[PDB]
Design a protein around this nucleic acid. Structure first.
Lengths: 137, 137
DNA sequence: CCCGCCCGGGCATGGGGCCG
DNA sequence: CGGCCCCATGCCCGGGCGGG
């Protein structure tokens, strides 16, 4: 068909479903998150980490990399550009989490990835709280 | 620059610049937000309201309508869909705000519009908090 | 007046995959 | 290997329709 609007990243069953160039980051996060990456039925989706920066390509790899039961990235999006001026675009990715601890852990995971991979770009991040749970079931 | 990644909606100098379909909501929101729509240079961008639903077109109208000094919508994006199945995509729009009062007002403003216009679709929403301020200057 | 839902066109890729 | 490439791709515009 004809896409007019963004589509959600498709979830993985096999590691093959994850695009090859993003596989190491993905694997890293798995090992990093451990049990915290599995879906916990009792938790509801109230948290996120927003990652942002000027490079959409790296952000896409990050989005492709965080896909798990309890940690799910949305697609690459962007922030409003502040000036009435059209400025350098600031891209972002929301990584949704089922609790606060996991979101902090997610932040730190990406930091450690950057530490091990100098050529990866340095992303800004912030913890996000939602008053009401998101329909991520 | 980066045609395959999303672009931040463009600001309006005057009301004629607002795309036609979004213009009624835009007018209404302007009047409802009142002084709170103007930028307060002391405030930092720590809040948002996320609106979500299944109509990307409705959400596009909302995104275009909320563009002000202190209220700035991002583009139409979507949430991850939890199951590895075919389920309706849930689209969303983050509307960024310079303080908490204003975000409450934004939430309310859309509720009012929906109350005046029963043909309009009912958007779910939540207030959103950031630990660190966003680079909306 | 405004609603949801529909459609075609156009840009400049940029990332999966080949080859040096 | 890992740097490089090129056309399937991801994005956005804006008009239109029948209806309440």
């Amino acid at each position: 068909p004809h896409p007019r609007y963004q589509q959600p990243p498709v979830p993985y069953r096999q590691i093959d479903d994850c695009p090859a160039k993003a596989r190491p980051q993905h694997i890293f996060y798995q090992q990093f998150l451990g049990k915290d990456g599995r879906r916990d039925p009792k938790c509801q989706w109230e948290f996120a980490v927003i990652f942002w920066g000027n490079d959409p390509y790296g952000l896409k790899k990050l989005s492709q990399a965080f896909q798990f039961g309890g940690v799910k990235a949305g697609p690459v999006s962007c922030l409003p550009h502040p000036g009435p001026d059209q400025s350098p675009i600031t891209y972002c990715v929301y990584v949704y989490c089922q609790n606060a601890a996991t979101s902090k852990k997610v932040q730190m995971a990406r930091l450690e990835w950057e530490a091990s991979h100098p050529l990866a770009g340095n992303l800004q991040s912030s913890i996000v709280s939602f008053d009401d749970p998101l329909p991520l079931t």
